[model samples]
Target: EKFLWGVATSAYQIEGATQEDGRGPSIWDAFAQRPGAIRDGSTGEPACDHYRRYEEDIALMQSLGVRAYRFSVAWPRILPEGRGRINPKGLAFYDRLVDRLLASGITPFLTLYHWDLPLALEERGGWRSRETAFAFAEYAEAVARALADRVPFFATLNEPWCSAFLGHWTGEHAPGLRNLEAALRAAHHLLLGHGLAVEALRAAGARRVGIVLNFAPAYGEDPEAVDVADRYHNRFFLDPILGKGYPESPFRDPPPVPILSRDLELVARPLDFLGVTYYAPVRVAPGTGTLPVRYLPPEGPATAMGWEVYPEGLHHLLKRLGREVPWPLYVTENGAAYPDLWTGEAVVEDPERVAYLEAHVEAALRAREEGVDLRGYFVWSLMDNFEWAFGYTRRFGLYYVDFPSQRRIPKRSALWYRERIARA
Candidate 1:
């Protein structure tokens, strides 16, 4: 078997106790506190409290028989103010967490940033400013110098598209805004920051470094709209980074947007691997506006988040990326959130999520057979935590979190995954 199996989680989503132990405020902390900002009006004040239960989580991963565990380091935790000073407690927490994973025989794939920018940084122009890119590189170097010897693979950023466009243009996520220019600037700087952070990690003696991009296959509502929507929705990010630049003719005749000097080079930094996070395909069509495209949700059974269930989209994305980017790829973050519950004391039987995983895993294997150079597959989450604007309303965990008792119940999917990994 030429595949690696693992699970993925983010800091803010899983590490609760938002204001504990000298930890400073993240953009999420500020956003979730605002009235009507989060569904259920819940804050991550004390989530799964993974900050306090990391050992138990690691044990759970060990029992799942996973070989790699991909997780993010909280920016605010490491640099409470986002820069200029290091937080000893924050560093110590990850030190303990990484050591625990090592002891459990799970290799750590550390992501330097996962959308939790410090509130202080957001106040100071956030990803819109080039200085934030430098700050991110500094923070990356700080963490790499501390853990490079122990961890082999390092991911600079997870889904720059979401951090830039979704958070800024859509204004549906933390530090939300709806400014188009700011969104474009943020997109460039986010990729630039990833490249600079990759340089920092490599200089600090890290060997394997890459980035994770969340990509969706764009389908048009009509035949006439297909080319335009695919160009803007999908190729906008993929072309530049893959060294193909934007497509010529219809897509770039007038140039849909401006390109900064050397921007492509920055985004095209050499990567040892590429991580693709797939959920569902986006159906796009012409909208009544200056913007050329509009998103139409696919027609299918939907997740709690209202995303269509389309595992075949993953196969298409992997195959497309492999042909274009020509690098080793991994299914970095792929899972669905649904309303779930603890039926008894600690038993959770989430069959919908189980079926979701089964379909995606099969999709991944099909991509592998098509010569994708695929390396691994990591489910989006291990346990439920702070899910941004949705708060705790949506649960995307293989392990159910019983908040009242603070106990974790590994769902049936987790057991199935364990068996799958063992066979692999």
Candidate 2:
């Protein structure tokens, strides 16, 4: 079983020091400023302070025995203006981080964009305009030129659905806007940016390039309702990359996105692997309102985030994706958050998270045995940090982070993970 056991984090979510060393403001930086934006009214000023303490974080990973660390390069750090001028200091930060990861014997999996779009780009239309895709490609090329040789895995984007629908349509995320048209364009350009980044990374001689998508298997009583939900949530992104073009109905009947010649071809660029981030399955029901589908409560124990726990969702998702996508699969992000109890002696025992991980890991192993070509599994985070929108309210880290003292206390789940990795 040649599989990777690792942990993951995004730049904005964990790497604080948002404004240090020529680092420009991202849409997240600006969004956190809105009065009612974050649930706890907290900005990501010193979330774990990973920028100044990456060595300590790397040491934590070494202790956990992670084979790889999947993290994103802050876009603003690399290209402060999101275009043209290269910020040497920003580039140097990642260069040093990658080097340190290599020295620790941990492979670095780099994601180009993880919803922290440089604020300058959002002002100029963000993902809503096709120009942003080209800008992303340029940024990808610059990073690849600097650190592609050391980073074994390069993911172009992380959860574009959140970037498109959450940010542009539902207005739940940064650069918040509520417009269907904006989301349609943002979704298209996000995939276009992915295709463009693939080209850029390959040009820089990257070893393996891919994209990460969040998947919540949709369930419904009505076949029509289920079809609609699946088309929007799943096939909308999958079909294009598989060279089948985009899906029909809901969003593509009249073709909302600009259908440039060979655009689909570019979107269909081959991938070395596909990263799947699954947390729960969604249950939708037919609605009488303007929206045809409404979400029903999932039937199971729930996480602190209120997401239901369903390990079988992981098994089914991997099987379905394997059948549909030719490329290999990796579980890039999967974990649960709980209101953990911090007992004395620097201990935070989270048995629920441990159980959550155990069941999911079993499901993943079963999927591999059942022929899903599953290549890797990375826990959602290395330590607790700034969860966007939720702020510091949600704790998804294997290691408990004391925000005030910047101290890291390993949860029992971390110990379990270390033992599990050793056995594997």
Candidate 3:
């Protein structure tokens, strides 16, 4: 109950004036251009149209009475070509946004990169090349110096595992490629960028730089399988970022890609705080083939995305993370996507989502009661915007945005969340 309650959103997922204001293309823009890439045959062209309607969005947040608003900056917006030239017009957008957030008594939690890498950088070897890491630091400094005075919290990267594994190995997201080696290399480069960005932000006199990792607690049929899942899912990034070198616990055969000469040093810098994004828990079992463990489908009620509804995983994961990492923890993202019903008067009713939010908050509160040192909680999103890969098919918003008219309609969950924040 003693924490900052907020909602979060990503740039590429919401802001759609992608080509305007000197904004260059990002990997998402290029990937979405391929035919049949996005399941809905949709690109982020008119996504919530937030680029032009952000003021309205901020007003909605103000009405909700959240203590903070966590959003991301599009990389190509600031460095149109990734690193060389600076785009002042793009930077001005966030300047106004931060000022508006503070004026509304909401803290600005800025994420430097949220999986939208500039296309120019991807063309130059993407995260596979170490050069991209340094470019990220430069980009971080440019943005931090630009708005750090107003922005209080900053996350260098959000879910690098997804960025590397899903985007590269699984070919589900932008810059789509299916290569395990590339994914492993990309993962390291992401952390290297995080550490460098942290250094750059601190040098710019910005305080409280951190990273966000999506935690899906892995439960297994046996202890050995569970350990493998823990090592790969959580410890792969968790231990390394918390000043521990690469983890070789359960799987250390090939030596985890190859860390460059100074990669470990750049990836292990201490963090001011760590953001944990919890959605659901996955079940793991001993593998019969190559992989030491295999994941099994969750047996429970699922969301519209087919993600299981597992709020108790939050308390367990938080307690484990609290025991391992000695920094203040923030549940920066926690929510689910489900079918929205159109209640009368154009009101979108979502009782299921409302229940999901309360259960997860209670999970967080219980973890805090047990001394997990939980600091804050931010809902997964502010509105139903462009859901990448799945397109706009899945909605994960407090307010339902009518994609046709760009109209903002607060759902039942939104109203419920506002009252909860008031009580908190």
Candidate 4:
């Protein structure tokens, strides 16, 4: 009956005052400032002001009875210039934050990179270049060497698919670009960076290191189109990191781009655990050659993000990984974002999100019963902060944040989650 429960957050999404305290420019800082880039004309410039309000946020985590908290460290905050010099102030903040988490009886799980690439690195080819991979390894070493004594688990990267495909192919994320070649290159180097970071952390005395991947169980319009779309959307990222290297010859026939021989070896570094971030399943069909895949609506209830409610997808993904990849697994992030608001001044109630969490947790338990060696589960977020591109429109937080007033209110789900974890 070993079970671990936690909440998750990313730095750029929550920590505001992008320029304060010697923080370097992240791709997010530059991207959010572009005209019409973020929805509602919102910028994370002063979003949660978490830089100053971390104590309040930690109080929320303590009150929620969370056993662990998974959060990403902002790379730009640490190495403001990205490569040459270190920002002592940025590093000091994390040192204080980690100490505070441990004081509250919460284990800290650190994700080294979560899409907040330093603008300095992005200017020099970003993840598309192998040099960036080496730089990431260096960054990981520095952080681990600094916080290894306090942090229990280190996750190398959050979601490389989004960092590669969404950012380079779809142009929907920071450093937005629509070049297919760049996207392919970025994907390879991201895995390369992950492996290098894993080696770096181990060198720095890290005992547990994992990589978190955002996996959606892909269904096709029909059986005929199933494998094609699944190979690209699902297995593309899974195979390489899991040691199988791309799935089929046809899929990597032209490769999306040229892959270095050394890069594949570096991407296959053994992992202590695999972290899965599940949200919704994708129903794919043949596109009109517009994008890689055309997603059809699944028949079911949907979340506020317009993602279909499919808890079975979570079970399926976990079981598949258990069978295929055969690694210790953890659901590092599995929650939905819904459109919720405050009522009666400081009170907020989000029943839809509550239902989603209940169903998904049950789904994970079922996967465990079915012999998936699942180790833990972490809710996707702890507070409503600045969602990239979508801005603050989508609410995925257990604790609600009033954007203008910067006030905090714990939603009903927060209480429900606390009781559930306590019982476990």
Instruction: Name the top TM-score candidate.
Output: 2
How far residue 342's Cα lies from its native spot in candidate 3, in Å, is: 3.3
1-424: candidate 2 lDDT, tens digit per residue: 4588989999988888888999999999999999888999998898889999999999999998998999999999988999988899999989999999999989898999999999999999999889999999999999999998889799999999899889988898998998878888898899999999999999998999999998888887898788778877888788888999887745433326676898889989999999999999888887544346788996899999889999998998999998888889999999999996565556688999999999999999899899998999999878998999999999999999989888899998999999999998
RMSD of 3: 1.6
Model 1 scores worst on lDDT over the 10 consecutive residues at 248-257
Provide the lDDT at 177 for model 1: 84
* Candidate 2: segments with Cα more than 4 A from true spot: 251-255, 288-290
Ranking by TM-score: 2, 3, 4, 1
Looking at candidate 2, what is the lDDT of residue 124? Answer: 98
Question: Taking the tens digit of each residue's C-alpha lDDT, what string does model 1 give over 24-89?
Answer: 898888878778878789887788888988998999999899888999999899899999888989
Model 4, stretches more than 4 Å misplaced?
249-256, 288-292
Instruction: Write one digit per residue (lDDT tens) for candidate 4, span 1-424.
Output: 4566999999998898688888889998888888878887787868788889999899999998898889999998889877878889988999999999999988898999999999999999999887999999999999999999889799999888899888988898988988878888898888888989999999998889989988878886576456667776678878988778877632323446667677777788888888889999888776645344677886699987889999988888888888976678889998889888686455578898999999999999899899988989999789898889889888899989887778888888998898988887
**All models: lDDT?**
0.83, 0.90, 0.89, 0.86
Tell me the lDDT of model 1 at 259.
Answer: 54
Sorting all predicted structures by lDDT, with the top scorer first, yields: 2, 3, 4, 1
Each model's total of backbone clashes: 0, 0, 0, 0
**lDDT at 422, model 3:** 87
What range of 10 consecutive residues in model 2 has the weakest lDDT sum?
Answer: 249-258
* lDDT (Cα) of model 3: 0.89
